[PDB]
């Protein structure tokens, strides 16, 4: 009865729309971006890992991060008031509470923001192919920052919210999971990479097929934000490409759906792949190759080559990257080429 | 007649030829057919190629133990370097094959045709009276194919380096490049990623929004696609209803409403961004590598405190060390 | 210096080739005169035999 | 039994045929190597 | 080479099956205008 009085208030066309969804989207979103910005400049990753992760410590924009919690923590939620932190905020900061805090708040923040796309769309009366499209990123973040770790030993192995702290997550994958050799990541790429091509070939086709509807050169104005005739010529375009690549669009409605399917689909396959690496169910090797190379020492393919790189990445990295393991690899063990 | 040449020049320039062979195309056509044909054979059958300088031949072809994912056309030898090794410079095909002759033939040709392909992407526009610049958007990929196949080697001193024509050897080029240039830590690559990552992001947006504002012109039991007709008069969706929503998602002015201004931002973002990565590979080709923060954040006594930049480097060493295991005789990798 | 030099100039050198195309392509169509859009009234394409 | 109301015809144009074969054949060139392993 | 023996089938079906599904539809479409 007042529900409405409220609904009315929330759905008021303000500068920054709000909505019921906003009662979730903003409490979290901010609270997450906030924690990052905090941890990034103030809190450390010394008791958790063993590195300086903030500005106050000496790190720069590239080398800072809100690094995951100690491995001994497990998959613990790390609630400020839980068994671990025991209510003490500062320690909470030291054990790595700021990570599950960002992870979880950001999580509900992406749930919130999608509901929004779904709330604003229902109101303004348009199809929801933008909350659907946004499922793609939910998949990525929900599988890379949540599922993956839940499959391993602790949270310690999830990306860490940092620029370099990610490049590390990249190499680790190449080194232990041999990701680049996974068909699912491959599709992932084929989609992000080709989604970029669509987002750039279409942009250029439109701009260089424009009818003249102005007098000057800066033809940006020639476009009446108001309805009517198409602004470029789909007919001319379809012609260009078809004679300069054999195939060419000719259904703006299909062109724009493809543009939604390509990049979205690829990030989905990208996800399924990682859901697999959570169980170390990777695509590490091709047995047919191994059996051959074991028997015949003169067989070498760019495949085998890369596998040695991995051995190296693990041997030299593991030690400082997995402190809770107390690894100790005597110089005589470290696999190495010649000279180097 | 009217002198065939006069006529020839008219066919070559036909504005209505299924596929527009142009003046540029007169080269693109044979060049790409030489490359494409040699590649396809090389990839199926072709002896192991002594890629590095030593005599440890790598086999990339299918008939020699590979599958589509591992196979590749291997780079001409290191003993060859930057020297021009065409077929006539070999004492026999076998020599040509063992030393990697196929690679040079294939890349010099692909780079030549892919360039004219860029030129062709202008000629046709002209012949069709349309605005140019499409060919300038395509200069990003080309620039990247140029970097990786020609610039990078001219810098390093040999085509033995420089991405090999094959799925897995492409991963090789990368995993090593990192260890040698710490690329992930180079501004130009990050802009490359913002471009490629961004590009996709917007491709989904544009494609998303538009699809979300198509004007009802079909039943429930028939494709939404039929609602459009090739060449149809006016627009096929409400560019105002579109902005009506997107504007409200973030906030009005944090949105588009000008198809021309919106579509340009689509072709400029990824192109400008991808150009950079090409400029990164082309830059790191002369050894101006990525950022280096190893042993910064040192503490009060002098103990090194290690930042993520170091775990990185730690994994980079592992790469640096094992790569090309039998090709080094001295301490520093200056090649 | 050899790095700094060679590096900077490849960037400049390159972008200029991009620049070249940009203008050579614009001035070569500003001449035929259509660098501002296709003439609604007379679309060259609309008067060419379809290929199918 | 008698004729059923709810009942439309099915459809698939050349383009879709072509785009399908492209999707299938390509998914096949991708996964075949991991099937033979 | 010691390849997976079911690979030749896993690939063969993975192509034919869905590939045929499409061929059926397409042709049955054409014939709704007596074509084929």
């Amino acid at each position: 009865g007042w529900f409405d009085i409220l609904d009315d208030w929330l759905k008021r066309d303000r500068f920054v729309f709000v909505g019921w969804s906003g009662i979730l989207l903003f409490p979290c979103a901010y609270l997450a971006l906030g924690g990052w910005l905090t941890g990034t400049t103030f809190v450390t990753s010394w008791y958790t890992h063993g590195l300086a992760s903030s500005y106050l410590e000496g790190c720069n924009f590239l080398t800072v991060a809100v690094s995951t919690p100690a491995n001994s923590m497990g998959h613990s939620l790390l609630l400020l008031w839980g068994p671990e932190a025991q209510g003490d905020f500062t320690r909470w900061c030291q054990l790595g509470g700021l990570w599950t805090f960002i992870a979880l708040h950001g999580a509900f923040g992406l749930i919130g923001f999608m509901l929004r796309q779904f709330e604003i769309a229902r109101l303004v009366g348009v199809r929801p192919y933008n909350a659907i499209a946004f499922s793609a990123p939910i998949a990525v973040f929900v599988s890379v920052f949540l599922i993956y770790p839940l499959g391993q030993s602790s949270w310690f192995f999830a990306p860490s919210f940092g620029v370099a702290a990610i490049f590390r997550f990249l190499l680790f994958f190449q080194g232990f999971h041999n990701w680049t050799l996974n068909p699912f990541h491959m599709m992932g790429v084929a989609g992000v990479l080709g989604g970029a091509l669509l987002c750039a070939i279409h942009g250029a086709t439109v701009e260089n097929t424009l009818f003249q509807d102005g007098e000057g050169a800066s033809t940006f104005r020639a476009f009446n934000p108001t309805q009517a005739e198409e602004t470029y010529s789909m007919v001319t375009a379809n012609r260009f490409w078809s004679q300069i690549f054999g195939i060419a669009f000719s259904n703006k409605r299909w062109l724009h759906f493809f543009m939604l399917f390509v990049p979205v689909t690829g990030l989905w396959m990208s996800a399924i792949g990682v859901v697999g690496l959570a169980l170390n169910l990777r695509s590490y090797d091709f047995i047919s190759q191994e059996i051959r190379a074991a028997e015949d020492p003169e067989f070498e393919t760019f495949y085998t080559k890369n596998l040695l790189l991995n051995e190296g990445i693990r041997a030299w990295m593991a030690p400082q990257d997995q402190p809770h393991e107390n690894f100790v690899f005597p110089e005589e063990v470290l696999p190495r080429g010649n000279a180097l | 007649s009217a002198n065939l040449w006069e006529r020839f020049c008219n066919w070559v320039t036909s504005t209505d030829n299924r596929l527009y062979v142009g003046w540029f195309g007169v080269i693109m056509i044979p060049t790409l057919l030489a490359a494409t044909i040699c590649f396809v054979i090389a990839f199926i059958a072709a002896p192991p190629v002594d890629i590095d300088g030593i005599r440890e031949p790598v086999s990339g072809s299918l008939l020699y133990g590979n599958n589509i994912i591992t196979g590749a056309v291997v780079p001409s030898s290191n003993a060859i370097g930057l020297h021009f090794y065409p077929i006539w410079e070999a004492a026999s095909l076998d020599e040509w094959l063992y030393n990697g002759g196929p690679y040079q033939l294939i890349i010099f040709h692909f780079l030549l045709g892919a360039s004219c392909y860029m030129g062709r992407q202008w000629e046709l526009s002209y012949r069709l009276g349309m605005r140019p610049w499409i060919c300038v958007a395509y200069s990003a990929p080309l620039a990247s194919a140029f970097a990786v196949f020609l610039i990078y080697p001219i810098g390093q001193g040999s085509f033995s380096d420089g991405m090999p024509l094959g799925i897995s050897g492409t991963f090789n080029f990368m995993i090593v490049f990192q260890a040698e240039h710490n690329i992930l830590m180079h501004p130009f690559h990050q802009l490359g990623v913002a471009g490629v990552f961004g590009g996709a992001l917007f491709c989904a947006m544009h494609g998303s929004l538009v699809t979300s504002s198509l004007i009802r012109e079909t039943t429930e039991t028939e494709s939404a696609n039929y609602g459009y007709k090739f060449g149809q008069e006016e627009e096929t969706y409400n560019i105002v209803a579109a902005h009506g929503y997107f504007g409200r998602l973030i906030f009005q002015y944090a949105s588009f409403n000008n198809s021309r201004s919106l579509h340009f931002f689509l072709a400029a973002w990824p192109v400008v961004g991808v150009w950079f990565t090409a400029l990164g590979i082309s830059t790191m080709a002369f050894n101006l590598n990525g950022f280096n923060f190893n042993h910064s954040v040192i503490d009060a006594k002098g103990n090194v405190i290690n930042t993520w930049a170091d775990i990185i480097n730690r994994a980079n060493l592992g790469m640096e060390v094992m790569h090309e295991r039998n090709a080094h005789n001295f301490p520093l990798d200056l090649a | 210096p050899r790095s700094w030099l060679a590096t900077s100039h490849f960037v400049l050198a390159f972008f200029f080739l991009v620049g070249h195309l940009w203008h050579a392509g614009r001035a070569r169509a500003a001449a035929a005169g259509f660098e501002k859009g296709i003439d609604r009234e007379s679309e060259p394409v609309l008067s060419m035999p379809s290929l199918d | 039994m008698e004729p059923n109301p709810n009942r439309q015809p099915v459809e698939l144009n050349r383009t879709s045929l072509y785009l399908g074969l492209l999707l299938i054949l390509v998914l096949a060139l991708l996964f075949s190597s991991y099937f033979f392993n | 080479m010691e390849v997976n023996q079911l690979g030749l089938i896993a690939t063969a079906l993975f192509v034919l099956v869905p590939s045929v599904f499409l061929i059926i539809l397409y042709v049955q479409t054409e014939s709704q205008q007596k074509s084929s």
């Binding site: 000719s250 | 199926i44 090739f230 | - | 050349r14 | -």
Partner: peptide
């Protein structure tokens, strides 16, 4: 036996390229 299986799927993509270009449904003006 694999070589053959790979070269086939490939020969198929290539024949499918021919058809998709020179045997499409012409985009007629409506």
């Amino acid at each position: 036996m694999e070589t053959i299986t790979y070269v086939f799927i490939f020969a198929c993509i290539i024949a499918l390229f021919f058809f998709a270009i020179f045997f499409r449904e012409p985009p007629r003006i409506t």
